[PDB]
Symmetry: D2
């Protein structure tokens, strides 16, 4: 995987973010999603890779663009592509927190090719955090006690993050019972997991159930940032089992370690759409010095080197024109 | 008012925010509110003012501490005091966005002594925005068209903020219909209005109904930051009408200009509790160089000088102790 | 001292910095110092203290300042870097420190040998002026957990520092030079992302006390020794109560008890950013100052970015008092 | 040029800056220079370009690596390359301000092929600045009067930067006489010129004489950032004249507009070595969340799109090992 591919990925997430931002607060999640898919597909076909989508918008049946197996790129090293054109379609449509655009790449087979099913998740940051510090079969109490001890703080100092859903009431009750602070996000458990390893996020642990593709994407970032995560797929009906079987997943009760979700040489890239726990959103900026531009905030990271790059980009634009000129 | 009072007010909002933060994500909004009220009252009584609460926790009937009319301070210049010990008690208990502590000071009679009722609000930023650019009796569309013209942008560039409530559906639908982007916050329309005049907030306009005290405090800040706002009190039942009559208000449908909400020499201070669209929340920080601390982010501003100070404070703390040691 | 005094002090350094900035790069050291002194004296006389200048310039030794309050000794520097500000060099600051009566070394205006390192856990003895430069740096490298080659040592670019510079480079350290501003240079050792690990050099005794006051709040260690070259200097020491001429002063001997330290950047430097002209459509035009205020008893540290409204169609000297 | 080349260039300047930093403050300007040359050369040969060095370390006579005419890169689109492995060799050896590493790319013939001679320079930033706002044959006073009018300020507000040299005494004295503020840098007039177009540099104008190669490099950045600049080569002896003649330059007194220095599609990249008035230098950082790393601060920009990216990169490193491990 050529060093060139890493920094090229940020252009993809930036262009998807700008397209998504033009639909921010338009009340239309489908238009938000399609703006991102279109921008990302077009940008990805300029990237010098021999790319196969292993996580994307869906099966070819249901998704015309960025479907599983689709071939993308202008030609280059062979890579598996995990992508999320718009993490937070509903978020973006109402301008909520934590919307992102996300692109990750691995050598062939480096990702768990996750089906569209739910996934139990537990994640903690820290480059020195050991394997086994968290696991999903241990109680919440016992996981937090270990985390607090490793971080060297009282339990009440820890900030635990989960989604505000009925399915999480027991995580929340238990975490609070042993003394921790638990904050709720409305959506965007990609940002919420990655935040555990993000300097100054204010989030120490993530515990929740959400999308499985999102779990792999977040593991890909934690692999570069440092941290630990365990995940397990959930299967509620026979169609979900069939989706897994079609992707080669047959050990349904497997507990996945972070190395099982994303392994080898991983590149992770993301751009903020709205302000979130991980990344700032797109903003309109005026200046006499340079004129008006849209500013994006992005991150690109690589697991092998552990180089993490924070990128602020200034994109020239006349806001006298319609904002949908940021589409494609 | 003696220039000393301005900067002393930040210490008050800081200690109240640290107390609030100890209850963040504990699912107990009464405990968060009380931690805030306690810390803020103890800190005020060390400020060198002869203070009279004109906006606070409530009437002496319902609020034992920081009630309307309470005298606070160690002695000094006579000021009316508008307080919100914790903007976002529910926010704070769940760790939502936009929780703040707030304190504003004016010469005697400078604030609208608002009864505790709903208030319709429209706000826009810009030191050169003219009085009349926004008006509650004009349509959303016409307000937006004027704002867009004044800012020199296409309508679709504008980001309108409002609270996610059924009472705002008509605002949201109309603003989208003429092409604007409308983002929703779950609570905290102090931050929401003030964001219109905060650099890099990504928010251009606020339209919505919320608390009347909060409207006054936001107007206090906008007086210092620059901008325009119009409010109108709303009355649901006859007891609310009596609360207005007791405060001297008989023109129930009076439209208040920003100068009617806050006039004269005004000091506005606020500290973030959680991350919001105005201020960052309190964070736990480690360093070998300094040891561990809590970081607060505050702003204090003054309407006469127009000076705005952004203050990042490092508060030493051993996080092996219980987080509630940050309470007063 | 009443907690009020700390945050009142930043206003003094800010006003002095704005006045200095109006003389930045004008080639007139005298006019810069006079602008700073005026602004500082005027602001100080609104602070609620019974202050006495024990380190100062007019703001002379023994001058009584303040509007009335707790008694404090005042160590001030209306403009650390008059030459600096006049030429637009790096590391010009305005500085105010306050202590309880007798908290500062009452230092004659003489030269002082200095060595300093940052870190709240640094023990007394980590630095010592009578150990070789090499043994000082080996201990600091051990304390910081790094190879010697990682350490960045700061000193002033002066012929009197050639032996320090050569000995530190010989043992493998990286030695960077500043043209002026050893207040900033010393405090940098305890300032996040200054990139300075150690300061070693000779400079003004007043400036050493001021830097020590800050390091007492930020955490670190420093040692100092006064230099006497002329009989006039020795008598200045005697008149101030100093008779042990070769005393090595620890950091607690320079600044003890409850200390407040305030500074504002004039030009960009190793510790603080300088004043800038800013334009915005939302907010209009303003001068931005960058300040720090700190207190030794609580170890609280406040960083303050202040936007001062101003129409830069008018002359800059309107920022004078 | 493929938009892939732009972001690949930052890796080159980052690697050269890290190598330079290992020699910072070691009092050896040659070893600093060689560390940077080595690292830039090696990195450059992994960039997918067919590159020809038009501005480099020297003529092949005197420079073995990165010489004028040298062919570099792994293969791709044809570009002319304007390099400065280490701007501020003496700066770096003393840890002074404004040391940078610099890589610029243009279409064939896009750069003035500058001889190793001195160059008179005047520069101002701002996208709307018209050609003629600055001119080397106008007085200093008249240049500054136009610049004050263009920026909408009193003359006393302007900050004029020059190098602290005897050859600049008349500039310094004239600029001060007409009321401007004139600050002095010891070295580093690449950074000093680009500062005029860099947000928050505090520098409005650069006026001085310095290296002609460094003038082309700074003009390349200003073409991306917006601004105007004029330059004239000066010749002190016969050997300097033939330096020009060898590179095809016989009009010895030509005044070059910025378009004459750098024209067409230009990419410009730089990384700070030491803190300066354009970029921050490399720093050693410790964190518990991430471990220890060297942090670099870079900028990459493009004249056709006007897109500018600020890049903060964290390079994992164990600082118990010798710092010379950052060499190539
Ligand atoms: Mn999605
Ligand atoms: Mn409240
Ligand atoms: Mn002085
Ligand atoms: Mn060079």
């Amino acid at each position: 995987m050529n060093r060139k591919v890493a920094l090229e990925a940020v252009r993809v997430t930036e262009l998807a973010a700008l397209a998504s931002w033009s639909q921010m607060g338009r009340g239309d999640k489908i238009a938000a999603d399609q703006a991102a898919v279109d921008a990302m597909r077009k940008a990805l076909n300029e990237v010098d890779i021999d790319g196969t989508v292993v996580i994307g918008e869906g099966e070819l049946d249901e998704a015309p663009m960025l479907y599983i197996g689709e071939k993308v790129g202008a030609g280059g090293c062979e890579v598996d592509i995990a992508l999320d054109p718009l993490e937070g379609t509903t978020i973006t449509s109402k301008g909520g927190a934590n919307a992102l655009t996300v692109l990750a790449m691995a050598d062939k087979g480096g990702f768990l090719n996750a089906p569209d099913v739910y996934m139990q998740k537990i994640a903690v940051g820290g480059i020195n955090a050991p394997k086994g510090i968290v696991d999903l079969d241990d109680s919440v109490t016992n996981n937090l006690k270990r985390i607090a001890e490793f971080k060297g703080v009282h339990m009440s100092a820890l900030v635990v993050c989960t989604m505000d859903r009925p399915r999480h009431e027991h995580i929340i009750k238990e975490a609070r019972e042993c003394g921790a602070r638990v904050i709720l996000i409305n959506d965007g458990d990609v940002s919420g997991v990655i935040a555990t390893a993000t300097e100054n996020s204010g989030i120490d642990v993530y515990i929740g159930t959400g999308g499985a593709p999102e779990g792999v994407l977040a593991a890909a970032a934690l692999k570069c940032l440092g941290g630990q995560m365990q995940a397990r797929l959930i299967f509620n009906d026979e169609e979900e089992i069939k989706r897994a079987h079609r992707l080669g997943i047959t050990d349904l009760n497997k507990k996945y370690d972070i190395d099982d979700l994303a392994s080898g040489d991983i590149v992770f890239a993301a751009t903020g759409v709205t302000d979130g726990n991980m990344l700032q959103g797109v903003k309109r900026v005026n200046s006499t010095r340079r004129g008006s531009y849209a500013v994006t905030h992005s991150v690109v990271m690589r697991s092998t080197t552990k180089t993490v790059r924070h990128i602020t980009a200034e994109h020239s634009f006349d806001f006298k024109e319609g904002i949908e000129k940021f589409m494609s």
